[PDB]
Amino acid sequence: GASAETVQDTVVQVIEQQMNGIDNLRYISSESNSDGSMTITVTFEQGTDP
Amino acid sequence: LDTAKAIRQTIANLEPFMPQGMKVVYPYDTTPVVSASIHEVVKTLGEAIL
């Protein structure tokens, strides 16, 4: 039952701000949606142990 | 040397959004001693050969 905006500022942004102090972190992205879902994708450098 | 470089590079991109009267300064920074060490020893090295 949440709007993109609700998922982005209540959940998707409270997480992103902690996404640091992680090794070989190349880049981070995310999505927030009407259906209420969201996903953060933390992509790493070649050679990281998954 | 790569790291200090990269950050300087990340701010260079961010400075151009900063307000009217703020400048970025680098108070502490040990990067230089690294380059000084390698420049010296490298130099002696070559005196050793002559």
Partner: protein, 50 residues
């Protein structure tokens, strides 16, 4: 494309059907990729126009 013209030519709804790249591990989709950001904190309107 022998099906791309079929609907992509609709005011009703875009129906862009496409094929996956050479190696799937990276994509679903060929060509290029990028994100336009918001470093000024202009807010949603500008970036949307940009």
């Amino acid at each position: 494309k022998r099906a791309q013209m079929h609907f992509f030519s609709f005011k009703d709804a875009m129906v862009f059907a496409f094929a996956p790249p050479s190696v799937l591990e990276l994509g679903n989709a060929t060509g290029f990729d990028l994100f336009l950001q918001d470093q000024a904190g202009v807010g949603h309107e500008v970036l949307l126009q940009a």
